[PDB]
Each structure stands twice: as C-alpha cells, then as structure tokens.
Design a protein around this ligand. Sequence first.
Ligand SMILES: O=P(O)(O)O[C@H]1[C@@H](OP(=O)(O)O)[C@@H](OP(=O)(O)O)[C@@H](OP(=O)(O)O)[C@@H](OP(=O)(O)O)[C@H]1OP(=O)(O)O
Length: 67
Amino acid sequence: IRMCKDLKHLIYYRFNTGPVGKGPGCGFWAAGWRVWLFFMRGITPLLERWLGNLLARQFEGRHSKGV
RNA sequence: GGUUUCUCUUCAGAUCGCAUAAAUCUUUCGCCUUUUACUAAAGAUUUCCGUGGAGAGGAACAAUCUGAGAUUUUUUGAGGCCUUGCUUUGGCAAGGCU
Ligand SMILES: O=P(O)(O)O[C@H]1[C@@H](OP(=O)(O)O)[C@@H](OP(=O)(O)O)[C@@H](OP(=O)(O)O)[C@@H](OP(=O)(O)O)[C@H]1OP(=O)(O)O
C-alpha cells in the first residue's frame, strides 16, 4: 500500500507539471497494477494452502487431539 | 539439408528474470498485558509467477527449401657432344666445344 502511494506521488508530480492542474484526470494505472500482480504472485500459494486446509477441515472434520 | 503449433522427458552451473512476491526456522531490534496479525535487519532454507538448452511424440501448412561444390629474362628447353678415373654400365666427378 505504501509503495502504491509512493508511486502515485511520482506519477502525479510528473503529470501535473505544465498547464495541467490538481484535477482528478490522471489515470496511469500500470505501476499499481504491476504491484498488485506481484503481490498476487506471492499470495497465491499461501491462500491456496489456507483454503485447502479450510476445505479439508470442513469435509474431513477436525482432528481432536491429532498432532 | 522445411515452417508453425501442442504435449512429454531430461539438463540449467547465464542479470536462468535488464523484473521481482510470499512463507518456514534461528537471532537481533521496534510496538508491546498475552496470542495471531505485526516492525526491519542478518543468516539458513522453500513455495509460487515466469525462463533457457537438448531429445521424443503428435497436428496443420509449403512440399520443395537451404547448402558445399607455352614460349618475350625468375616455374619451363642452352639443348647435345669427345677425353681421364670409377664404371656404381641409368651415369658421377673434371676441359675446350657448340
Ligand atoms: O498525499 P496523499 O495523502 O496520498 O493525498 C493525495 C494528495 O492530496 P493531499 O495534498 O491533500 O495529501 C494529492 O494532492 P496534491 O498535493 O498532489 O495536489 C492528490 O490530490 P490532487 O488530485 O488534487 O492532486 C491526491 O488526490 P487523488 O488521489 O484523488 O487524485 C491524493 O489525495 P487523496 O488521498 O484524497 O486521494
């Protein structure tokens, strides 16, 4: 989130330079899109393992003593 | 001595990736009632998103294509001839010849 905020500042202070002002008209979404896809690369196996454990506890049942 | 595409197997020691996430363990910090979820540095490992080389099989298209392959100076007649020793009998070593 912090990286995205920093990127926005960078983009805005390369955008609002000449006659353009502080309007909401700047949409240059490639950098934040890159950041959230690299996050999604990292968060795919962790969420896969977590939801697999959730489904296995939902269907196989919870081991009482177990480990 | 074809291209394109799909799948499988094997090897990566190249910035395998002119990009970059996450997790585990051991310690140091910070926040701090306690536990997750946390802070950010190191080390040891992993997973994931991708990649390169080689081989094999399949499918669709061009059906070949791409190759490798002489006289006029200095590289051709200034060529033949008797004698002495050896003849090693194809001639060698020495003289005036043309
Ligand atoms: O720095 P942030 O906290 O991330 O807020 C910014 C900032 O607004 P603030 O100055 O008030 O903090 C920008 O403003 P500028 O200084 O660059 O002019 C910009 O606002 P502008 O559109 O007017 O440039 C942008 O706004 P937005 O993302 O809507 O485009 C956004 O403000 P927000 O946090 O409200 O979104």
